[PDB]
Design a binder for this molecule. Structure first.
Ligand SMILES: CCC[C@H](C)C1(CC)C(=O)NC(=S)NC1=O
Ligand SMILES: CCC[C@H](C)C1(CC)C(=O)NC(=S)NC1=O
Lengths: 168, 168, 168, 168
């Protein structure tokens, strides 16, 4: 590539993997969103919460793809694995699964940052810090807060309704 | 009729029956609405929900009557049977009865559509699809969502109050 | 399902398959979009054209999922297969592949409509006609128009630049 | 210096060198700009492109000088070497020379960042990342895109005119 400079093949490949992880995360949130839209689940606040997260992860993937091109790397796409569950249980179950997912994304980000540091790639490191690392930390804090409130509310049916109405 | 074209006597009669069904549905919702306005029931959100549905069914009947005339059919009215209950019990009972009513209207619509198809009456078929079929599907989904939330809330008295305050 | 009415297991499954097809189409357009964003391809008008299509297909999938829930069907997700190519060649190659993709989506829509008709499911048939069938016909006409203009322009390099600047 | 803290003599000197590089880059773009303003070259879009870059590099130098003072370093200026060419040939030649220049600036930035990291000077590292590293990456991507389009257009005279009219 005519523009490629200080961009290692290792980082390029790791960025492609992280794109796949973000798209897969988006797909998972899509599934979570429509599960709470089921007539036998019917928690619209929860549905909206997860659908918004699907959009955020998709946007994250697109930002990574833009950066890949800006650096002269080449986007390579793989199959997107279907979400790990077909039915997501209670709001509590769903939020626990969401925090597990975000922590795995966060760890992938931290791994990529470490790689960037080892390759002496400051543009990559700054890119991750500015657009991804703090966003993940804030989202995980929010999920933790939600989990704590859901747990304190669980009269389980009553608690789930009130959380959806008054928080989400 | 000078304007009548491709409008079978079978469809004409079925449309008159569907008008009666919609007016009867409107009357039922009128009764449901005023039951929840009783001082010993006193659930204003529920009262408003059903009164709005009474207006919707009445409007549906008028749209059918307009179409009957547009096609050159002749409106024939029958007695409107009084609603099946004088007292409607809990919000849960009422919502269950409402979904039963809507499914019966929906089935009458599907039957009429089938008749239209067999008579090769595309104007009728399009009319039902554009103004009735999707409206019914959306209303039934909403009722299902309500039923699910009411059920998860039923501290029965507390649940009924919260649903009325926070959803309706 | 408490709300499910006149919704066959066959249609439910076919809708799930069509969701997968739309998500896969969205993924393909995502890949096409970022290919034209490469510094060694650099056709921004083409990139934007395909990225907008990615968004349209994704929205189509979400509308299908909403309808699945409205009817009381159950969304089931499968792996999304990666796009059929990693590199998409010229604008001409890409547009040809795009029209092939849209025709396959269109055929899946026509198959589903035929299924709906055979199952006597007028809500499904109306849903497809109102939101999908005409959109596909219009998009395919537009692509055909583009293909014809690209072809008349192909001084191949010059033609590709002018099309991107003056049409897209 | 009363304010100087954690600012090594090595970084101070490297910053002075980078100021010289940016001023020299500004001077080069000034020359490129006025070459395309010649009546026997006459490509106003190209002239404007390079004149804007002259202003950007000059601003970059001033930001470095401001930072030097903020840290308690002492600005030292050297002769500015005249640009490497008096005449810049075709738009293609000029854009190639521009990308070579930007890559050399980028490498100087990466070297300075590496120095900062080795000296444990996080303020310097953050300063470069926030104001210089991403700007360079974006500018180099843009130049690569331009080069690719110029190349696809080169009927050389015709191609050069169209690029100037329709892109710049
Ligand atoms: C908002 C969900 C997006 C969706 C899950 C998905 C991946 C399947 C995505 O992340 N991005 C695009 S472009 N299309 C898609 O279908
Ligand atoms: C816009 C060009 C600026 C110009 C080349 C130059 C260096 C010669 C510069 O970069 N900055 C200042 S203050 N004066 C100058 O003459």
């Amino acid at each position: 590539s005519q523009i490629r400079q200080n961009y290692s093949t290792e980082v390029e490949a790791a960025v492609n993997r992280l794109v796949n992880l973000y798209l897969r995360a988006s797909y998972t949130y899509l599934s979570l969103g429509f599960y709470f839209d089921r007539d036998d689940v019917a928690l619209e606040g929860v549905c909206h919460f997860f659908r918004e997260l699907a959009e955020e992860k998709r946007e994250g993937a697109e930002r990574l793809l833009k950066m890949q091109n800006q650096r002269g790397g080449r986007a390579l796409f793989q199959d997107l694995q279907k979400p790990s569950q077909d039915e997501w249980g209670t709001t509590l179950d769903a939020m626990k699964a969401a925090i597990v997912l975000e922590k795995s994304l966060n760890q992938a980000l931290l791994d990529l940052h470490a790689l960037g540091s080892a390759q002496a790639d400051p543009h990559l490191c700054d890119f991750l810090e500015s657009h991804f690392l703090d966003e993940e930390v804030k989202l995980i804090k929010k999920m933790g807060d939600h989990l704590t409130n859901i747990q304190r509310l669980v009269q389980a049916g009553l608690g789930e309704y009130l959380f959806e109405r008054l928080t989400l």
